[PDB]
């Protein structure tokens with residue numbers, strides 16, 4: 690009788706859950722890209738440090 | 754009508770709660786989008802610096818070789 694309201698609330702809760710799963714898809718993708726970019730940034734910082742050390746080494750050799 | 758009042762107040766409270774939650778969600782998404790953009794730009798700068806350095810080191814190594 691009023692179980693119309695029951696089906697409607699179950700459906701509302703399912704629609705909400707699908708929308709939250711779409712939101713999570715988006716934020717999870719963005720978060721994973723961010724994680725990847727942070728790792729690649731760290732790698733680039735480390736590489737630059739090593740390359741700059743080698744550059745100063747070689748400059749020292751060449752001034753003697 | 755107390756009934757009409759009760760029903761409309763309940764729906765409106767629920768709509769505030771909804772819209773404030775939506776504001777929070779979109780703000781979080783926007784911060785993540787901005788952070789991705791920032792990191793791509795930072796890593797572009799770093800990658801150009803690193804490739805410059807690799808080229809410079811390689812030139813210095815050739816100069817060293819020029820004397821052995």
Ligand SMILES: [Cl-]
Pocket residue numbers: 708709712713778
């Ligand atoms: Cl959500």
Ligand SMILES: [Cl-]
Pocket residue numbers: 713
């Ligand atoms: Cl979550």
Ligand SMILES: [Cl-]
Pocket residue numbers: 739740743
């Ligand atoms: Cl090196």
Ligand code: NA
Pocket residue numbers: 793794795797798
């Ligand atoms: Na840049």
